Every structure is written in C-alpha cells, then in structure tokens.
Amino acid sequence: VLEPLVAVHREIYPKADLSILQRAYEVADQRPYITHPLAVANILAELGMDTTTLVALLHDTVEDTGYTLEALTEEFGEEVGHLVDGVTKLDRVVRVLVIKVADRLHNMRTMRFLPPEKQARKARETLEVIAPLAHRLGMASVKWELEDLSFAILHPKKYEEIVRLVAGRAPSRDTYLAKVRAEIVNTLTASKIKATVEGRPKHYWSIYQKMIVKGRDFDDIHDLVGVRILCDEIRDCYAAVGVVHSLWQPMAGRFKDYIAQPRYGVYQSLHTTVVGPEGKPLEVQIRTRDMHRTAEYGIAAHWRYKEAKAEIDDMAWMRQL
Amino acid sequence: LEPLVAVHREIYPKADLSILQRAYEVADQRYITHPLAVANILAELGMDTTTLVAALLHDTVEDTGYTLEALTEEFGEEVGHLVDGVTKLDRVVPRVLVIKVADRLHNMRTMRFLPPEKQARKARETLEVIAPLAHRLGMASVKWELEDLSFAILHPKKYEEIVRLVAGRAPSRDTYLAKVRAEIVNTLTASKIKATVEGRPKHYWSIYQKMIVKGRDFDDIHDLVGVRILCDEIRDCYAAVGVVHSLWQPMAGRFKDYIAQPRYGVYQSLHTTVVGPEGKPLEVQIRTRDMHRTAEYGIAAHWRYKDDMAWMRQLLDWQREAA
Ligand SMILES: [Mg+2]
Ligand SMILES: [Mg+2]
Structure with a gap:
C-alpha cells in the first residue's frame, strides 16, 4: 500500500x-x-x-x-x-x-x-x-x-440514453475502426515510423453537448469513430499526417497544427479530419509521448489564463468570486 | 584525360x-x-x-x-x-x-x-x-x-513564345516561390527535419503540351510554381507532407504516394497539391536524395511494358520511330 x-x-x-x-x-x-x-x-x-x-x-x-x-x-x-x-x-x-x-x-x-x-x-x-x-x-x-x-x-436517464445509444451500433462501429487501425499501421510499418495507434477514449458529457447543438437525429455511426496516433519525436508526428493522407482524402478548413501554433500555451497537437473508408469523417489526433504527458496529466499553468462569465490562489478566488 | x-x-x-x-x-x-x-x-x-x-x-x-x-x-x-x-x-x-x-x-x-x-x-x-x-x-x-x-x-517561334511568356511574369512569379521557400523552411527547421528546398526546374516542351490540351487562355501565373523538397530517409519524406499541410490546405484529389505504390518499376515519390497560399494551386514533390538520384538518373527499367531483349525492344522502339 x-x-x-x-x-x-x-x-x-x-x-x-x-x-x-x-x-x-x-x-x-x-x-x-x-x-x-x-x-x-x-x-x-x-x-x-x-x-x-x-x-x-x-x-x-x-x-x-x-x-x-x-x-x-x-x-x-x-x-x-x-x-x-x-x-x-x-x-x-x-x-x-x-x-x-x-x-x-x-x-x-x-x-x-x-x-x-x-x-x-x-x-x-x-x-x-x-x-x-x-x-x-x-x-x-x-x-x-x-x-x-x-x-x-x-x-441519469440522459446518461442511460447515451450509453444505451452508444451500445447499439457498437459491434458494427468497433469493426470499422479495427480495419482503419490495420490499414493505418501497415503502411507506417513499411515506412519505418515508430508509432502507437490507439483508439480514442470516449466521453458521454461530450456526446451529450455534441448532440444538443446538432439536435435530435444527429449521425451516430461516425461521431463516435475517433482515432489517435502517438510518436517519439515531432518529425514522426508530421510523418503520420503523411501516411494518413496517403490512405484517405482530407477535408478542407478542418485542419490544425497546434505544434506549429500554440493556443492556451503549448497544446502541442495536430488535428486532422479526412473522408473515410465508407465516406465517414474520421477525427485523427497525432501528438508525441512527451506532448501526451502534458496534454492529459501534468502541467503548471504559467500563462494565458483568461477569466470568463501562490498567485494562482488569489486568481482562483477571483474566478469563483 | x-x-x-x-x-x-x-x-x-x-x-x-x-x-x-x-x-x-x-x-x-x-x-x-x-x-x-x-x-x-x-x-x-x-x-x-x-x-x-x-x-x-x-x-x-x-x-x-x-x-x-x-x-x-x-x-x-x-x-x-x-x-x-x-x-x-x-x-x-541494357x-x-x-x-x-x-x-x-x-x-x-x-x-x-x-x-x-x-x-x-x-x-x-x-x-x-x-x-x-x-x-x-x-x-x-x-x-x-x-x-x-x-x-x-x-x-522555333513556338519555343520563342513559351520562353517569352515565361519571361513576362517571371519577377512576380519568382517572388511567390521565395516567400513559399522561406515559410516552408522556417517551420521544418523548428520541427528539426533535415531538408533541401529547391525550386523545380522548368521545361518548355511540357508547357507546350500542357497549354495545347488546356487551350490558349490559361493561367500562366500558377502553371509552374513547383517546389521540390528533398530528404535523406523515407520517414522524413512523410514529415515534409506534414509541414506543407500545416501551412496550406490540401486538394482532395490529385494526391499520390508512389513510395507506397510504385508505378511499374520503383519511382518512389510523394506528389501533393495545395491551394490558398496565393489562392492558386502549387505542386509539391517530396522524395529522398536516394530516391531523387534514382528518378533523375534511372539506370534502367526492367521492362517498358510496350542481346535478344535489346533487339526486340529495339524492334518496338524502331516501330515507334516509324510512327
Ligand atoms: Mg477530503
Ligand atoms: Mg559516334
């Protein structure tokens, strides 16, 4: 213990x-x-x-x-x-x-x-x-x-609604990803790029608001199809965008490079959406291991704080009051 | 000597x-x-x-x-x-x-x-x-x-016209490429990728056929603004496609990956076209130094698909000549 x-x-x-x-x-x-x-x-x-x-x-x-x-x-x-x-x-x-x-x-x-x-x-x-x-x-x-x-x-029943709505098309949707994962991994192994190709871990409050803005009758099959790539160095992250685009046609105006341009400090991530193997918009999220360490778990929050609606503690009190 | x-x-x-x-x-x-x-x-x-x-x-x-x-x-x-x-x-x-x-x-x-x-x-x-x-x-x-x-x-006068037309908008057209080369090179030096960024060497016979199939009225400003990135290793060629896309928006079609799928014998190369830097498409052609050597000075192809090998190929060659 x-x-x-x-x-x-x-x-x-x-x-x-x-x-x-x-x-x-x-x-x-x-x-x-x-x-x-x-x-x-x-x-x-x-x-x-x-x-x-x-x-x-x-x-x-x-x-x-x-x-x-x-x-x-x-x-x-x-x-x-x-x-x-x-x-x-x-x-x-x-x-x-x-x-x-x-x-x-x-x-x-x-x-x-x-x-x-x-x-x-x-x-x-x-x-x-x-x-x-x-x-x-x-x-x-x-x-x-x-x-x-x-x-x-x-x-509770809204959570139930979602997790139930998630569970329905799960087998068909899970297979579709398993192809993509294979198709993407094959070519980068030929290319000799060391990279992990996990599926995106999903969230129900996101799905709830995402549905709310879109309204009822929104598309369930492709909204839940997200994928991530992980790489050792910045070079390889840019290399991933190479192999993705080789396999599928990209969508205009939905492309970003936060490694190139940091917002709210260093996000250090590349976001791209492409038209998919069955014409599906698939959200890819390439970023390094070191950048992952930052993105999910550890940060000190030094600058670019913005109010809405240690020095941080007085800052926080002001934020609640 | x-x-x-x-x-x-x-x-x-x-x-x-x-x-x-x-x-x-x-x-x-x-x-x-x-x-x-x-x-x-x-x-x-x-x-x-x-x-x-x-x-x-x-x-x-x-x-x-x-x-x-x-x-x-x-x-x-x-x-x-x-x-x-x-x-x-x-x-x-051979x-x-x-x-x-x-x-x-x-x-x-x-x-x-x-x-x-x-x-x-x-x-x-x-x-x-x-x-x-x-x-x-x-x-x-x-x-x-x-x-x-x-x-x-x-x-002679067709050639003259192509070199003349090329010469006219040259100063405006070469300035874009100088800005594009800079914008590309800045970001890949931040990304820490070793890459040469030369301008594409132009050919007039190509311009002749291109304008023939596309007719007289054609956009000379963006016809040939081509860039050619060059990198040591396959990994880095894919990394180039990254920096390009980071800066400008890629066209849906016209994308290729010859490293992944070599047409006939090995012509490993990454062709990509992107629009909106100047509001006009620009043809990028990434490939390795080894790949580049290969392409520019290909020693030979195993077979064109169209001693004895030399004589018969020669025979088809000579028929094409008669044509
Ligand atoms: Mg307690
Ligand atoms: Mg002689």
Whole structure:
C-alpha cells in the first residue's frame, strides 16, 4: 500500500530526503478509513508533483484532529504550512490548486454513501467550477473523468440514453475502426515510423453537448469513430499526417497544427479530419509521448489564463468570486 | 584525360585502372572529344568501367581501318558485344542502350552542323523514339534535356513564345516561390527535419503540351510554381507532407504516394497539391536524395511494358520511330 505509492514517485526522479514522506504518512496514520490522503497522494504522484506536495497526506488533519497548523509547520516546514492551510481555505463556490482537484477527483470516484445534499450538489459543483478549472490546469484525464461521473448523477436517464445509444451500433462501429487501425499501421510499418495507434477514449458529457447543438437525429455511426496516433519525436508526428493522407482524402478548413501554433500555451497537437473508408469523417489526433504527458496529466499553468462569465490562489478566488 | 577518372573513381574504389588508360590511349591514336565527352556523362550516371572503356572505342570501327576482331582481342568479349551492339543501332526517322542515349544527348547539345538534314530530323527522331526510350529506362535528366533542345529547333517561334511568356511574369512569379521557400523552411527547421528546398526546374516542351490540351487562355501565373523538397530517409519524406499541410490546405484529389505504390518499376515519390497560399494551386514533390538520384538518373527499367531483349525492344522502339 505505502510501497507502491512511494514507488510510483521514485521512478520519476531519484530524490533525497525520503525520511520526510515516511514521517508524513506515519504522523498522519497516528493522527471508514484513513486512506483518502494516501489515495490522493498516489494520484498526485501519478501526475508527478513535488515530494513536499505528497507530504502536504497531512492536509485533512487540522479539521478532523485536535492538533493545529502551528504544530504541523514546525515539524515539516513553512511550505507545508502554507499548502495545508491554502488547500483548507478553498471551499465550495457557486500547488494548492492541483492538490484540491485530486482530493475532489477521488471523492467523486468513491461515493459509497449517497446522503442527499452532498451527492447531487457535488456533481453540480464539480461540473460548474472544477471541470473548467481542471481544464485551465491543462490535464484532460482529470477533467474528462470528473465530468462523466458528475453527468451520470445529475442526468441519469440522459446518461442511460447515451450509453444505451452508444451500445447499439457498437459491434458494427468497433469493426470499422479495427480495419482503419490495420490499414493505418501497415503502411507506417513499411515506412519505418515508430508509432502507437490507439483508439480514442470516449466521453458521454461530450456526446451529450455534441448532440444538443446538432439536435435530435444527429449521425451516430461516425461521431463516435475517433482515432489517435502517438510518436517519439515531432518529425514522426508530421510523418503520420503523411501516411494518413496517403490512405484517405482530407477535408478542407478542418485542419490544425497546434505544434506549429500554440493556443492556451503549448497544446502541442495536430488535428486532422479526412473522408473515410465508407465516406465517414474520421477525427485523427497525432501528438508525441512527451506532448501526451502534458496534454492529459501534468502541467503548471504559467500563462494565458483568461477569466470568463501562490498567485494562482488569489486568481482562483477571483474566478469563483 | 585526367578529370574523367575523378568523377568515376569516387563512386566506387575499383581495380584494373590500366584498362581505361589503355582505352583512351588506343582511341586517341586510332576532334576526338566525342568518345570521352560521352564517357564523362556516362560516368556522371555511374556506369561500369567496361562500359566506360567501350564507350571510349565504340565509333572507331566506322572511322578507323581497324576492325572488331582486333578490338575485342585487346579488351575481351564484353567490349566486343557492346561496341558492336551500339553500332547496329542506327537512325530511325541494357549497357549498350545507355551508351547510345548518351551519344545522341551530346550530339543534340552541340549542333554547329546546322546544314545537315539532321538539324530538324535528328531532333524529330529524338522526340519520337529517344525521349521515350530515355524515359522508359527511368532516366529523366537525360529526357528533360533531349526534348527542350529538339523542340526548340523543331518549332522555333513556338519555343520563342513559351520562353517569352515565361519571361513576362517571371519577377512576380519568382517572388511567390521565395516567400513559399522561406515559410516552408522556417517551420521544418523548428520541427528539426533535415531538408533541401529547391525550386523545380522548368521545361518548355511540357508547357507546350500542357497549354495545347488546356487551350490558349490559361493561367500562366500558377502553371509552374513547383517546389521540390528533398530528404535523406523515407520517414522524413512523410514529415515534409506534414509541414506543407500545416501551412496550406490540401486538394482532395490529385494526391499520390508512389513510395507506397510504385508505378511499374520503383519511382518512389510523394506528389501533393495545395491551394490558398496565393489562392492558386502549387505542386509539391517530396522524395529522398536516394530516391531523387534514382528518378533523375534511372539506370534502367526492367521492362517498358510496350542481346535478344535489346533487339526486340529495339524492334518496338524502331516501330515507334516509324510512327
Ligand atoms: Mg477530503
Ligand atoms: Mg559516334
């Protein structure tokens, strides 16, 4: 339990002063279960935040236990002091910023008990102010999941409608992709380009809004047919566009190169749509492994923040207020 | 002469240099530049030393009292077969074949003898059979040249009109290409792809046929703005298609991938057309340095699809000539 989470940290960076994170958990353990801090500490370690953030395991202690921040800060430091306080100060809104999104992500995933007010409203709150905030942090895996869960609880029969509507044409649609995957992989293996060719992991809240704007009677067969390519270096990402276009005719005005032009900072992705093997618009999304690391899980959110409707914490409060 | 050896030698460190010294020496003793001048343009293609020797003593027998029986004994059977085989190929209205194309290409380059009937006829002959024969093997650099010289002589005022029309909009047209070359090169240097970005070399016989099939009123501004990207390895050729598409929007049809699907023998090359940089289509032609070598100086094609192989192909060739 403790070993795997620390192991998931160590592979990233051979770091010094391991005796703080042992101290962190030990003191927390002594201070239905105590796993939430460590469970969080793992999904933060999976993102790859600082060992101080990992320590800062001790975030829920001051509200639940008798001991206080003045005692806490002395044991570990001033940084842990500011963090645990900063994360505690954040409340429901009609380092510190990333720690919170993890805390909530887990709580959303684990809803064993469904007492009333917390349940429906947490979903509502997450969608309203946590999904976009997560999106500002540039981590797609955090947001995407947070939404789907939230969407299920808020609109159950609408979720049901989608997942049922998804399930109907699944066998025909899944086969169609399996051909494309083969057809695309063959030629790049002849071309000698090292690349992974996964299918796009799909999301129901996306499908919900995508349907809403299009209206009822929208096309189901091709909307759910998305594919991704992954490459080692920028050269190879541009090479993929080569092989794709060789196999199928591209569509005008739907082509992008975010590697060439970054929006909201470094997205580092190429998006193209082509007319398909059965005349289907198929959305391809080429990007590197290093760029994937950024796109889905890890970012610091330095610049190009924009309001709508640490310095980030006062920024965030302004955003909710 | 001395420099002929230098262009040949750096291709392949080879033994028995004495034969090519013997070749020129015995030829010199037997205007004597035509053999060696040919022997150079063959060496530029990169033919076998035996081919270099033969092409050095191929025309001797007709101009010189010495015969093939004496000639073959000095240099063996191979040079016997070559020098004879090429002589047998006469005027019509694989090593042997390549030597002949080099000869006609040289004689076409230098035409101080305008008086002979060949000036127009020899040109007529090359366009009818030698241009397709050169092209069939896979050699374009030879073909490209052969045509422009032949076509210039055959139709003087038509040629004049094409070069004139070309010259008119040249400054406006060359400026686009300078901007396109810059915009392309900036982004591939950011992408960190090693790639040369030359402009396409234009041909007037092509413009003649293109405008004939498309009629008099045709867009001269975008007809030939062609770019030619060049990269080391197959991977990088696909990477070029990337940078091009990043900058401009590609046409649905007119796309090809000859590396993936080589027409007849291997002509591996990526042809793509894109519009909207200037609101006009531009033809991009990506291929490897190796691929480029191959295309420009194709040694030969196994078969055109339209010794004994040489004679019968020659026979179809000669029928095309009669045509
Ligand atoms: Mg908590
Ligand atoms: Mg001769």
